[PDB]
Amino acid sequence: EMNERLEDEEEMNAELTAKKRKLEDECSELKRDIDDLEL
Amino acid sequence: EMNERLEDEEEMNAELTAKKRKLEDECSELKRDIDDLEL
């Protein structure tokens, strides 16, 4: 039982980190363009 | 330990999701403020 649920949170750890990577990416795209534009 | 790792990954899930809360917030202010800026 302890393994079957920890594996839930680890795949969730991946589900988080994947989205997190997609965040850091998209946040930097938007942030870049705005900063360039303001110049 | 397996139980301790649940206590690890719940807080780890919280630390990540809290970062995600900052990442999601900024990106939304980014996309919104662009809209105002374009108007």
Side-chain angles (χ1 to χ4, degrees):
Chain A
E1 61 169 89
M2 289 180 179
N3 291 338
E4 295 184 303
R5 301 173 300 221
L6 183 59
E7 291 184 295
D8 179 61
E9 309 303 42
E10 292 186 277
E11 183 285 331
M12 182 61 72
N13 183 55
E15 292 181 300
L16 289 172
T17 60
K19 186 64 180 64
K20 181 179 179 295
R21 184 179 178 179
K22 294 187 176 184
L23 287 170
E24 297 181 291
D25 186 331
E26 211 200 344
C27 68
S28 296
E29 297 181 293
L30 296 174
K31 213 160 188 168
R32 180 180 179 277
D33 185 56
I34 298 175
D35 193 329
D36 273 308
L37 185 62
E38 71 184 47
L39 296 176
Chain B
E1 186 185 357
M2 291 179 184
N3 291 114
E4 189 227 36
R5 293 190 177 248
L6 191 63
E7 69 186 51
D8 291 300
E9 301 313 302
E10 293 176 286
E11 299 183 338
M12 180 62 72
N13 183 55
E15 300 181 339
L16 288 173
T17 60
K19 185 65 178 64
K20 182 180 63 181
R21 183 178 179 179
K22 295 184 179 181
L23 301 182
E24 182 286 330
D25 186 330
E26 190 189 289
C27 63
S28 296
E29 294 183 297
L30 293 178
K31 297 181 180 182
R32 182 175 178 278
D33 291 343
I34 293 177
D35 187 55
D36 289 320
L37 185 62
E38 66 181 56
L39 294 175

